[PDB]
Symmetry: D2
Subunit: 435 residues, 4 copies
């Protein structure tokens, strides 16, 4: 806790993100619909961020597939702005402030996605930059683009006015009341790898703007080689390329959790990415799917929530919330599970063998959480000894998702679990307590 | 197999404005180099007058590009000469008048292009001749050149892509272009070799109805694409940009070794331009500025000798009009040039202790031997006749010196200083 | 004609190799049976080399899977020798000379495989090298092994005794009467790439032994980066990792031939590898198979022979020859087809599109050969215009495998071809 | 991090002496004993306790840092390398290192050895037994795993029956001898195979099964961050870098490696900046581009290195021949005030790095703040840092720890003119 911005995400951010349901193309009405649902059914459980994902500045976006080289909505200072057809309250140069105001009044927080860099249409016209006389063209990198989106060019920190530009972006965002930015094309790039210098300029720009804004970075895989950079400069960073509702990616996440578990801490959260639950693909064609309810089975959905919960990943719901059924809503409203996310710490892989995995973490009151997973293709008993958990005596055991006491455990936990199925258990002391 | 081979039966010889003028050569500088060539060089085979990169960039002024600037372009997305630097191009005539002039001097004309389609055309979605699709419809979304900002790559799968490239070589053919040096096409730090654009270019050339020699740059060309190059291009750069630095000339020896088996009629691995004479007038590359080549006279000869015996294309990179007599002599020795024009089979006989020997032959029995001391120490460099495949004594002649040397019984051997070479002809003794 | 050793392989070497049929484990009697069949049925068609493949020095070899870290027969100069149990004529220190004599007396030539380097056991025991007084241990490389075979360590050309050792190997092989050597762990290596310095040492050693020994390098893929080295130093070098009777490997060879076609020439032959035809996998387990007749369909077997013929690959039969049926023998003995391999030149890919591929070559007699291939998964017409072939008027066309005149062709060649099916056509001037 | 019982074996970063930088592969028993005695006498009160015999104690002809390849090695009947009795006479009679370690334990010190990953090639070639089993060394060897810079072993294949039994047997031996520390080589970086993760785990388990506390050190680096979890959970120490030597370029480079590794430092699991080339080194080593010599590090460089290792909390393993130290060299090892930062400091972080100026800070439980300030440029210059940037909320007492000299009150910032390659180590405490 050396870095002031850690205090802005004491626990891992929880919220909703338009990407998995709406792709690049979410409207004001949809945002607000999801915000209202959150306010009323989710906010008591920690869910507070409402994040407008990529390309809110792209008036014609209608998918997860971007329309390349198209005109973007922009101000007179080379800054992108919301598309007024999609966000009508943005009329009159108001930007996202009205939307942000309405979200804040719900008791909720406001987020946006930005692309690293400065828009290409700005560099080519050479539009001005607020606060300086250099123009957009003079701060652009001559060899730095995003391989999967044509909207921007990279900015070169070595040029006069580079920081001025980033500063000016975060002044705008701060005026609008943004509480959370998800930066893209910054951690992993086929072409260039991690854009470290822009991460630094962005941390600087946030710090200078005077409003607390949580910094999320994307896409992954984040290299461990930049662990220290990430831990000191970002509140979240994506461990993985885009996550979707396919078992192979959920399977894969276990190793990434294992590789990143030691960097997890207050204010600096490796990110397992958004939860493809409920109603997705409405205007997204990504993940090899279209308009659907998540292809994860119920066991898969639990398995994911359980891992993300115990690991302390940010939780960003990715479905259209208003179409949650009760099952889906139950995944988000169980306070006993969420305690593991909010107050747990120390999470670690106890072991992984024959596609059985066990993680454990604890709280400050001496409860110990254990998450046990069968990530194989067959039904099998998964178990762990109390000794391997560091429990030197017998313990009471409770199934947190079912909310049901399991009684006393003297030597080990052991459960028959179908393929892709898990269980999350709380262990609490038996010795020196009532009956 | 390939008809375009007949367009470069011997390796191209010429002049190129890059090393002396960077991106910024004027119509006057070109005219004057061409006039010097017609007068002093044409009899020895020098014929291409190549206008290098960025003739379409009115502001160009160095070897360092001005990025993201507007460029001169027609109404079908095709770049055009900058009228300020090329006054004869006024009124949409492009390069036809300069080329005409050059043709009327008995010479050929070439230009440099960048792979792809101008970024400004894609941004503005300007038309493509012969189609209803626009520039933006044929562009690659993830293809740029890492060291220049002018273009986006073209995506051969899009409708209209080949039409675009066709339309460029229609324009070049209207102008009378005889030679095109394509850039950002062979090696790319980001993407490697742009294979599919090499094929569209080949095809656009073939369809335009005029013989246009195809040169590919920058290198290093990968040996992995040897077939593609041999079959599609007349010349291809073995190396990133060559300059007047010993280390780069030293390095070329291995590259020539590496490529020697793909050298052949119509298809020439290219050791790049000759940074001789007066260079860096408006170029700042190679770690130098306005200067005469930093190669010593020995180094110049060593270079000329390797490029000659290997059969690299020869593109003089200095401002010819500032040649002194030494420099002119390197270009006007017929005996040496015969080795380039009519030699074949060049091969490295050996390389050992930074002594190197190359050999080639003509069809009339003559054997050429180039002997090189690329070490830092004076020494005798020798080679046996037997290792050259000569089974009895021969006569030797020093081709640069034009002097007979006498009978060689067993070995050719000379004292050579560091960086110094000799080129010898052997033929039957009396 | 710059390298004298080019004249040892003026046309692409043709023969039989024990690997595909017997793995590491062939016996003398098996070699002899194959050589007898070759002498009787194949020799006049050009087939002449009888090549004993890897580990003739490993008495317990029994498959294509090597027995690691086991003892190896060796002489008193650190040189591997044949296992007398498998090669009984080698009894009493005679090595392969008696078996080489037998094969020479059938009118045939004799080949062996060797592993690059010097035996590990020789380095550990520090046994002697002939012609010098450093031991084996002093010439070994300290960081060079084969990732897939444990027999040897690499030899370090910077050490005194290194060339002496390679020289001694080729003295022995020449004493034996070896005419061909296939060297392994030398072209491609997952750990180290191409072993160029050993290639040079072996070239020199062959040149010094005073017998023509054709030099074959393996396994691939050969990098184009070393094309000059290969061209000047070897008579054949493998374009590919080990080839087997699997359609996918056959599909993949089309590209490799394209990539190497400009280096094919007299004495220096890019090698598409041994032909997995007939009865293979008797004591081999490679290629995903066991004891079998080739899993290539007849169409695939024709496709392979067609490509290898026109491209001018060496032709090394990998099956047990005595189990050839008539069909299989016919693949090896079509005079008209062999003409393209023996007397053609200039092979090139005319095009490759939607998995249809056309190759062409010619002889000096006026004849142009065109090999047309459907390498797609569906029946389709494959075609090419006389013009794309560089043919300026009507030509008589003949199917070479079928030996059947197809008549006059005025504009193009066009054939319905099954998936994986091919045709080989000669075009000649209209009567 | 607190999960693993072996963390308790290295609560502070191991401190000791290692034979590599002074004697290569070639140290004798008398040299080990001499350095041990020196340690017991002059250094043990400041935390120095490990006496580590480096590589190739089993190679009787060894004579340098350059290995003699493919040579027969001293080995028991169970495929386990044994001390060369010519170099370690007290090992005569199959006693191995027990006598030597007993000697060192009696000085109140701890004993360390170096091992190469794997099983000896000669064991595999002869197919010598694996203790406690009916399998042979040949049955457990990998057929494609070697060290690119040493020929002594083949890798062990964890999937083979007996593989774990072999490693268990090694650590039974080492425990019998009384070994307290093992430096394992050819395990973290390999130009040919990368990190040998499965052998790391076999070794962890063998140690856990042997019944004695044995500190696990891994080498050589660079250790990839990609395996940070593995190293943190399985080892007490792991090399950040390839072998470190008395050259400035290598010292300069370590600054970035510490920056990269600083979040994985913690009780029981210490990223290692490698042994300290101080004093008399290169006596039977030819590595580092040097020969027999006193270290080529200037005093400033020596301090700069001590200071970064101190504040970062790298283990400290002296690589010179201790009996030849001067008072200067000794003074680097005996300053309690500096060592408190290594022993009791935590949270070490780079405050910033700019124009070859670097500042690190850490703190202790008493709210002292330690700050190390480095000029790693080629120019003399003033290096500074604000107390705001140190997160010191108000004015502070300052003290130069190496000089042991109060600097008085500091209100706004620390600033010092430092030579090139020169550093200072300061402690800030609350005022009055
Ligand atoms: O979730 C994805 C993310 O990886 C980003 O970089 O680009 C678009 C979406 O926001
Ligand atoms: O000679 C250089 C060449 O390498 C090319 O690629 O770019 C511009 C110049 O023409
Ligand atoms: O044909 C294979 C070959 O590729 C070689 O490298 O080793 C074994 C067989 O001889
Ligand atoms: O210190 C070096 C170390 O890096 C090891 O890997 O090899 C021998 C020495 O102990």
């Amino acid at each position: 806790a050396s870095m002031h911005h850690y205090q802005w995400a004491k626990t891992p951010p929880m919220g909703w993100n338009s990407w998995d349901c709406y792709g690049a193309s979410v409207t004001e009405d949809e945002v607000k619909g999801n915000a209202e649902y959150m306010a009323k059914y989710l906010k008591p459980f920690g869910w507070e961020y409402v994040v407008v994902d990529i390309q809110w500045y792209e008036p014609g976006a209608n998918s997860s597939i971007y329309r390349p080289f198209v005109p973007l909505e922009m101000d007179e200072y080379s800054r992108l702005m919301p598309a007024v057809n999609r966000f009508p309250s943005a009329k009159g140069g108001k930007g996202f402030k009205p939307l942000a105001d309405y979200i804040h009044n719900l008791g909720l927080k406001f987020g946006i996605h930005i692309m690293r860099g400065i828009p290409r249409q700005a560099v080519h016209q050479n539009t001005p930059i607020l606060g300086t006389n250099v123009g957009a063209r003079d701060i652009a990198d001559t060899n730095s683009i995003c391989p999967w989106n044509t909207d921007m060019y990279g900015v070169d920190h070595r040029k006069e006015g580079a920081q001025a530009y980033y500063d000016s972006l975060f002044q705008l965002y701060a005026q609008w009341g943004v509480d959370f930015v998800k930066v893209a094309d910054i951690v992993a790039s086929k072409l260039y790898g991690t854009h470290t210098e822009e991460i630094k300029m962005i941390r600087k720009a946030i710090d200078r703007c005077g409003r607390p804004i949580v910094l999320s970075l994307s896409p992954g895989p984040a290299p461990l080689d930049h662990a220290t950079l990430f831990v000191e400069n970002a509140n979240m960073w994506r461990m993985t390329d885009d996550f979707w509702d396919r078992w192979e990616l959920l399977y894969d996440m276990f190793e990434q959790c294992y590789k990143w578990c030691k960097l997890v801490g207050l204010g600096h959260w490796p990110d397992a990415d958004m939860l493809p639950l409920g109603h997705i693909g409405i205007r997204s064609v990504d993940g090899g799917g279209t308009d659907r309810m998540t292809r994860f089975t119920k066991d898969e959905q639990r398995t994911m929530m359980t891992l993300w919960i115990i690991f302390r990943s940010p939780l960003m719901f990715g479905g259209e919330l208003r179409d949650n059924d009760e099952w889906t809503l139950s995944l988000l409203t169980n306070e006993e599970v969420l305690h593991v996310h909010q107050n747990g710490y120390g999470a670690r892989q106890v072991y992984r063998e024959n596609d059985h995995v066990v993680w454990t973490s604890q709280d400050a009151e001496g409860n110990q959480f254990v998450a046990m997973f069968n990530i194989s293709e067959k039904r099998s008993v998964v178990s762990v000894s109390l000794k391997d958990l560091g429990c030197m005596e017998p313990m009471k055991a409770r199934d947190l998702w079912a909310k049901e006491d399991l009684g006393l455990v003297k030597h080990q936990l052991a459960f028959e679990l179908g393929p892709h199925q898990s269980i999350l258990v709380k262990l609490s002391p038996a010795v020196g307590k009532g009956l």
